[PDB]
Amino acid sequence: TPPAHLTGEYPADRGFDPLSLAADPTVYARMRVSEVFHARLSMLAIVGAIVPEVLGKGAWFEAGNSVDGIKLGFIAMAIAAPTEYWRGNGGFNWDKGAADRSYPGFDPLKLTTDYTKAAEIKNGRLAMAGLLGLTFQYLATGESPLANLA
Amino acid sequence: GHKDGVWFPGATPPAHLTGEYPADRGFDPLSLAADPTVYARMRVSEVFHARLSMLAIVGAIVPEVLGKGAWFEAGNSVDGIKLGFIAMAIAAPTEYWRGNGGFNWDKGAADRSYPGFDPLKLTTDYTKAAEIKNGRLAMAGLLGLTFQYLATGESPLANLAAHLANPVGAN
């Protein structure tokens, strides 16, 4: 049975809130943006944990003795600083926005449907679940992703 | 009023830029030219920076072509301090005369950007817009020559000789 605050207005809605975290609408608005971003980040990660380990580059937990983790961490944080601020601000100016910060502009093909909006978050939810799993298998064994498949 | 287009596909020109002065492509995101009196000055400075850059990118290459080393080896081939002193001692009257628009204390009211040195009578709107266009290239070029020398350390013409024989694996 769907909850009271969680109605079926927004994409990928299934009526799941046993914890009542998104009771307030403005909270739910933030939740939604944060779910989409977490989904979008988890996909580049789930793929980025397989694709440069298939080609003979070594596993995701082996990355430490292939890069300088401190320095790469610095580089990543130094390019995240402008771009995350711009994502958050909705542009470059001091006063905020009016350029929708979840679903900005990048669609030259007119693919923004409610189906595709739902499928952004649908594919994302199991990429998240996958990544949550991928780590748990490594902590309970000692194995790589494709080695865990055996 | 932009017949020749704009710097970004669908961009709106700024309010102070209305396609009236040469080579306006409606580009001022930091709004440095909002004040008109300042924009008048800005125009002269850009054209001058342009004309200085074109003599410089030539002077960094045409000596190198005739086998004299690159531009960063010019310090070996000249006395660096001394020529710098004579350059500053010759620029002093001539730059003052350029700024004053003449030789008399109370200014001249000649166009100090476009003075009138033209025995071939080529002064047209196209040529004004081509001064700045060829200029913006040469500035960008000179900005390259410095940054290429900092990231590499070989000659300018050697970096071109790399890139034709190394399209992938240049950067």
Partner: protein, 180 residues
């Protein structure tokens, strides 16, 4: 609203009326003629100033305590760890500063130049001008420190003490006459 000017007999720009603290009619390069940029410039001026004030005390005081010189700190301290950990710590704070609050839509509309972090109720249109002027002084100072770092290659307290001990043999003239 009488106010002083930065150069004797000049006339101020027409967009600088004295309406804001520490206005001295100074914008020859016309970088604040549009009002919205003048709003951001104003926030930036106070924030660069505040950081220069922290910086210049941070640069001078550990050298006074004999803990080292500010531009030689990176041979004892790893820069990349320091900068990673700093950006991790600073990021949500800077985020909230630019945002205007903790909410995604701003919501809790705070002043992003002058929030209320003032338990002594000391804020006036005068203390604002004092904050700006102290900040401008510190920015000029931090420019001095960097150029002095390159030219003399000694620390700033050392540079001061050298000028006091040998005012003629330790000044900008003598230090720039030599190759340096």
């Amino acid at each position: 609203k009488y106010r002083g000017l930065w150069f004797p007999n000049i006339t101020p720009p027409a967009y600088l009326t004295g309406e804001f603290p520490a206005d001295r009619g100074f914008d020859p390069a016309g970088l604040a003629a549009d009002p919205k940029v003048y709003e951001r410039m104003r926030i930036a001026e106070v924030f660069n100033g505040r950081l220069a004030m922290l910086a210049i005390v941070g640069c001078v005081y550990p050298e006074l305590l004999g803990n080292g010189v500010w531009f030689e700190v990176w041979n004892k301290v790893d820069f990349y760890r320091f900068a990673l950990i700093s950006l991790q710590v600073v990021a949500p704070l800077e985020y909230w500063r630019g945002n205007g609050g903790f909410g995604w839509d701003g919501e809790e509309k705070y002043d992003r130049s002058y929030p209320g972090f003032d338990p002594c109720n000391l804020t006036t249109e005068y203390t604002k001008a004092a904050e700006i002027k102290n900040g401008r002084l510190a920015m000029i100072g931090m420019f001095g420190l960097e150029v002095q770092s390159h030219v003399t290659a000694q620390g700033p307290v050392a540079n001061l003490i050298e000028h006091l001990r040998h005012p003629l043999a330790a000044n900008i003239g003598a230090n720039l006459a030599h190759p340096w």
